[PDB]
Design a protein around this ligand. Structure first.
Ligand code: LVH
Ligand code: LVH
Lengths: 228, 202
């Protein structure tokens, strides 16, 4: 059977997202650091396509719409994944369990330190808020559906986004927060998403100064040929 | 402040709608320059903004100024589909943006934001809460406390407007997600722009 996105209960949504989670990858072991970080990003992207196809409502969109969303969100998704992993490592970014880099290691590449500092600050914010795994998967799905939303069909994305918000609220209510604390926590998290967008924009600026629609269209389509 | 006193203080702080002078880039830069002076006056009236040090006030305004100009523009343009109401005497269509290189992509994103606010039926009381959120958030414990207060104010407005508990969180989320889009637009604008006034006014 197949659950349509808008029929999922909060528990079914959490179960589907937890099941969709990509694995934690290892680094293949200043030019060497950039090479290792690009290779890791390339490998995470293959898993990100598999994950996006399992995000409720994503497959309901046309292939062209799926590509637009992934093209706009891929760096924000890699970054939220990085900051989540790095939570328990103050002052460091856990790119991989065998690639834990300090702030000073980022200074070896020009313009990279400002991005590393913003990522560290986001990781510190999630740590202080005690972000839960179930909340993290909801936020990452929201980035996917929201980042390219304003760039019937549009109503469907917004209704799926409402379902994910209901899921975040349900998690917070079960965790013991009052209705007021639920709204404050949801707002805090969504405001952090605007900083994640900021980081991706600064990241993309750096990339273009030295992962296209075409590459993503081919990878999203090639997924149909993978074994079940 | 109660939620109603917060809304009253924000509505009272609202800057005026300015007119364009009597070429498109020149008129738009001059209008932005004039709106900035009013934006500083508005910022000083946002509860909690004067509680911050002068250096913190400057940091927040420096990080948020383009997002604030853009949200203001998008709010004004709501009742004008396919157009950006820069001023009552300067209503520009999408095609008029194509006269300047790289400007069309920004105009399209602003038009899409205006269309989203129109479809959500964004209220004036909600708009002033969002604009205060951008100011305190873009360059971000006291600030976090004020941010928590603005969320409570948005919820209070929605509850008084007759939304259910469920509709309140869904609407709060939809309004705050648009702030990620406003951030994106401001970053794209800063990119285009790069390719003392604040201290004196404060
Ligand atoms: C710190 C970020 C985020 C990040 C990166 N690598 C990750 C791996 C796993 C998880 C997160 C990341 C890295 C280091 C990065 C990246 F995400 C993508 C590429 C792609 C290259 C290409 O297409 O030719 C290159 C990179 F260096 N960025 C840097 C930028 C400037 C993008 F913000
Ligand atoms: C569409 C935007 C937003 C905008 C603008 N003017 C507004 C007036 C009133 C309300 C909104 C706006 C304008 C046209 C704009 C601006 F906001 C600032 C300057 C500053 C120049 C300087 O300091 O030398 C120049 C501008 F053209 N931008 C273009 C961007 C920056 C995104 F590229």
């Amino acid at each position: 059977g197949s659950h349509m996105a808008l029929s999922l209960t909060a528990d079914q949504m959490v179960s589907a997202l937890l099941d969709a989670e990509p694995p934690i990858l290892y680094s293949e072991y200043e030019a060497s650091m950039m090479g290792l970080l690009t290779n890791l990003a390339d490998r995470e992207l293959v898993h990100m396509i598999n994950w996006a196809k399992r995000v409720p409502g994503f497959v309901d969109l046309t292939l062209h719409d799926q590509v637009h969303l992934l093209e706009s969100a891929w760096l924000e998704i890699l970054m939220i994944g990085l900051v989540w992993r790095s939570m328990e490592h103050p002052g460091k970014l856990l790119f991989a369990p065998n690639l834990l880099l300090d702030r000073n290691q980022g200074k070896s590449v020009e313009g990279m330190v400002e991005i590393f500092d913003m990522l560290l600050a986001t990781s510190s914010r999630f740590r202080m808020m005690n972000l839960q795994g179930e909340e993290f998967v909801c936020l990452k799905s929201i980035i996917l559906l929201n980042s390219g939303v304003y760039t019937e069909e549009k109503d469907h994305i917004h209704r799926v986004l409402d379902k994910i918000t209901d899921t975040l609220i349900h998690l917070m209510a079960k965790a013991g927060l009052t209705l007021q604390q639920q709204h404050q926590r949801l707002a805090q998290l969504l405001l952090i998403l605007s900083h994640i967008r900021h980081m991706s924009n600064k990241g993309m600026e750096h990339l273009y100064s030295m992962p296209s629609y075409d590459l993503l269209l081919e990878m999203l389509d090639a997924h149909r040929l993978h074994a079940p």
